[PDB]
Amino acid sequence: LPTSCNPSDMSHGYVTVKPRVRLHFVELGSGPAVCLCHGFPESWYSWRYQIPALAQAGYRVLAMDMKGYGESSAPPEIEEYCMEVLCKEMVTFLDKLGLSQAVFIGHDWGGMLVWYMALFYPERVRAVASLNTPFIPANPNMSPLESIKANPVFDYQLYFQEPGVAEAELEQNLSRTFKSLFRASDESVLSMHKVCEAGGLFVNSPEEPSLSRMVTEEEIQFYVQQFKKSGFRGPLNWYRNMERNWKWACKSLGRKILIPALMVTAEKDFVLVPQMSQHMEDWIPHLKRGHIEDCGHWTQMDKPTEVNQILIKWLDSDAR
């Protein structure tokens, strides 16, 4: 029920960061620059309820299509989607727009990106906020695979490793894909914890799922249209750089995040659980917190009013 966005009525921007890589964004508002970075497998449009509210609150909002998504380039090579490359391209993005800094707010994979922007490019990050995704320092003595085996919470990510396997499932029926994923906690039709065992996300879920209370048919169809452009290889490639990302992260151990930071947890996200964020204060002294009850993984569309309230209070206080 907050004001949403009609894609045709937005300003659409395009920056070529590298010869074969152009990033698309939508832009609304005047004021301090706030760059919104979505998760997997989402869109700029995942911020549809935030963009008007933040603009109305006196910010210049730039909502990205992240690399691999929507109208942004989606090269096929896996290494184009490591965190080092993605962060270097976000800095390039700011350079070509002529922005010395922005506030970076991310969700899910985008949350992980904004943490590594805060860590490796603090001079370009005015303040940083994550929805659901915690910041956890790399362990230089535990490989990613060892980390999955040891504690198999994220073991669905093994299904995403082999190029072509998860793509065939997710691209088979895009409407079913998005209707199956984009649900409230209590409406779930699949368990991310059971993916490995079953050999897929939707192997035991309805062929024709109902529409979640969170989304309309027209909203689903927007995602469908966006993912017809490049499909799921680029999006999935975000998961296929585990060793590279771990090595890069290990180069930063010990250094803290001292810029203003906000961590927002979601009570009913059963993958990125609130408890994963405990002790972040040890590495982020200037850490503020928020929490949303009755809120699952799809934070922005499950509880948009609460997200908007939290982000605007924090922005008005600690990033301005």
Ligand SMILES: Cc1ccc(S(=O)(=O)N2C[C@H]3C[C@H](C(=O)NCc4ccc(Cl)cc4Cl)C[C@H]3C2)cc1
């Ligand atoms: C330093 C570092 C640590 C961990 C990592 S990680 O382990 O690779 N991963 C954890 C986060 C969780 C994820 C993600 O998989 N989100 C899809 C998702 C979630 C819930 C639901 Cl219900 C449904 C769906 Cl499709 C994106 C993030 C990256 C990387 C780097």
